[PDB]
């Protein structure tokens, strides 16, 4: 009897002919963890699917690309019922034969059942609630799900082959739950902090940075234009450079009245690009917001104010437009990255030499016993470190401002238009740390036990790393990969305890 | 602490989920504990409307019908 109820509390009887102890009724309830039914994971669900995801920049923020075939199988009952509701099929069987035949008329029946009918999209690491979002389906040839770029951040979804799952909201309450709660457009803000999670990601923000930027002398410098309309007319036709300092008449709005939009017009000192971009900015936002260089931080604060001022609808439609225009102008820019785009300081080799004398100095002090071994070590490590800072802030100065150009005079100097700098400055991708590894020397790596090798990597990636330098680089990589691969699981555990306690 | 505080939950179906099942079932079965649902974990197990969000209207309307004329 004991073995039947709960096995393992006495002898652990073993099943017939099989060494493994037979599972008893208590073991049927139990598991990992607690119950199997609802624990991760947790029941399979009908009307569902999944596949590789791709980009789809054409989408509006409220929709997503859905493969024709996926949609056919998903909505099969909807298709069957609509087919004989309109009388295209005698009976359900004949309808089945119709979609099984894929008769041409059925695709149109599917456009009816899809139109207003959100589908749920999900990704692997469902962490916060933004992990599931509703979209309006758009029928797409091909087997890949297309996902609006602006959402890729909330999902933490790359395009490197990540797959996403689709779910159909069958019941009416679910359709309306999807549209009014989980819809893409209705959650634009992170629940962790009110900052917008729809912030433009990389190509788009590089577009706006290249758009609103100004060089010192460019075609059309000094002229004046009536309004953004004729600014674009000037640019697209090839008369004026995208970035040139120009005064143009603009009309801004301020809602500073009591629920009422004030208007004011003036001659603003600006560039051509910022002028064109103004066409997108809705209503009550001031022109002050676009007159700057528009980095990734500012371009977010743009959206936030737009939300806190005009409300939701204007912010959404605003967001869509920024993406479309960001991608578009960035493509025109022809930004690229060459090998001659990474500029090594001319003084690098000299800094290394100077930093190299200190180490041979401290060594001489240790040979004569003037300084202890540990004190020696710390010294050498410090000078090399100081050297790294020196080279970094060397290549940073050279790289940043070195564009030296002429307006009507001899010279002047502005922020460089060099490709890789624009990337790092705008906030798109790359950072001062990583740039430092490209051009200036990269670091002093660390041996597995946690100590730091006193002979740094004097080279960088634009130059070659020799055998040793690479090998020393390896430990750092391996601890990185290992830490993330284990620490990924750990994060989940924390949320678990938390949601259980709340 | 969080892991300790999550231990106490009135509803036993919730507790049989994340705690040790055997112990929860016994220790509850002797006292004849009557689980009223009212929680999230338990309503999900049994498969009805969550007592929050869209469901909050439901549970509210039922909770008042209960222990009432």
């Amino acid at each position: 009897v004991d073995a039947l109820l709960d096995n393992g509390r006495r002898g652990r009887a073993i099943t017939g002919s099989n060494k493994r102890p037979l599972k008893s009724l208590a073991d049927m309830i139990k598991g990992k963890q607690g119950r199997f039914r609802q624990n991760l994971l947790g029941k399979r669900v009908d009307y569902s699917g999944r596949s590789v995801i791709t980009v789809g920049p054409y989408l509006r923020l409220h929709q997503c690309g859905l493969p024709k075939k996926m949609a056919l199988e998903l909505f099969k009952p909807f298709i069957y019922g609509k087919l004989e509701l309109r009388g295209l099929a005698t009976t359900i069987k004949a309808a089945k034969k119709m979609v099984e035949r894929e008769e041409a008329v059925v695709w149109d029946i599917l456009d009816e059942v899809i139109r207003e009918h959100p589908v749920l999209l999900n990704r692997a690491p469902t962490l916060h609630r933004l992990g599931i979002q509703a979209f309006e389906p758009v029928l797409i040839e091909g087997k890949a799900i297309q996902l609006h770029p602006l959402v890729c951040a909330a999902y933490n979804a790359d395009f490197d082959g990540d797959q996403m799952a689709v779910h159909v909201p069958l019941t009416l309450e679910a359709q309306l739950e999807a549209r009014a709660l989980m819809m893409s457009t209705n959650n634009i803000l992170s629940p962790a902090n009110g900052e917008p999670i729809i912030v433009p990601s990389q190509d788009v923000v590089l577009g706006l940075y290249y758009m609103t930027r100004d060089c010192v002398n460019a075609k059309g410098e000094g002229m004046v234009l009536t309004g953004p309309k004729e600014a674009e007319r000037l640019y697209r036709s090839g008369l004026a450079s995208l970035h040139a300092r120009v005064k143009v008449r603009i009309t801004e709005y301020e809602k500073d009245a009591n629920g009422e939009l004030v208007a004011k017009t003036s001659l603003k000192d600006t560039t051509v690009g910022r002028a064109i971009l103004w066409m997108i900015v809705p209503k009550g936002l001031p022109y002050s917001i676009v007159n700057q260089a528009l980095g990734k931080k500012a371009i977010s604060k743009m959206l936030n104010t737009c939300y806190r001022i005009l409300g939701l609808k204007p912010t959404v439609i605003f967001a869509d437009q920024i993406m479309y225009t960001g991608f578009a102008y960035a493509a025109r820019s022809g930004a690229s990255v060459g090998i001659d785009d990474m500029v090594i300081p001319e003084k690098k080799h000299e800094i290394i030499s100077e930093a190299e004398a200190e180490v041979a100095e401290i060594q001489e002090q240790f040979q004569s016993g003037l300084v202890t071994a540990g004190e020696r070590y710390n010294k050498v490590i410090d000078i090399w470190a100081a050297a790294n800072d020196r080279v970094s802030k060397a290549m940073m100065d050279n790289l940043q401002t070195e564009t030296v150009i002429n307006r009507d005079g001899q010279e002047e100097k502005q922020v460089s238009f060099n490709s890789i700098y624009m990337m790092a400055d705008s906030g798109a991708r790359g950072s001062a740390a990583q740039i430092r590894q490209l051009a200036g020397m990269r670091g002093l790596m660390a041996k597995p036990d946690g100590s730091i090798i006193e002979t740094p990597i004097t080279a960088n990636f634009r130059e070659g790393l020799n055998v040793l330098q690479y090998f020393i680089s390896t430990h750092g990589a391996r601890k990185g990969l290992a830490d993330t691969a284990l620490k990924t699981a750990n994060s989940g555990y924390l949320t678990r305890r938390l949601v259980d306690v709340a | 602490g969080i892991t300790k505080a999550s231990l106490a939950t009135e509803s036993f179906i919730s507790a049989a989920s994340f705690q040790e099942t055997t112990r929860v079932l016994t220790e509850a079965a002797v006292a004849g504990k009557r689980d009223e649902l009212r929680g999230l974990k338990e309503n999900v197990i049994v498969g009805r409307l969550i007592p929050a969000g869209t469901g909050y209207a439901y549970h509210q309307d039922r909770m008042r019908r209960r222990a009432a004329g």
Binding site: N490, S491, L494, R497, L498 | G1, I2, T3, K4
Partner: peptide, 22 residues
């Protein structure tokens, strides 16, 4: 100390190793 495990310790209330007294 610090890091993600530091957070878990905080929410777990664990009394530190060499605590002070009030």
């Amino acid at each position: 100390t610090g890091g993600l495990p530091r957070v878990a310790d905080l929410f777990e209330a664990r009394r530190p190793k060499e605590p002070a007294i009030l």
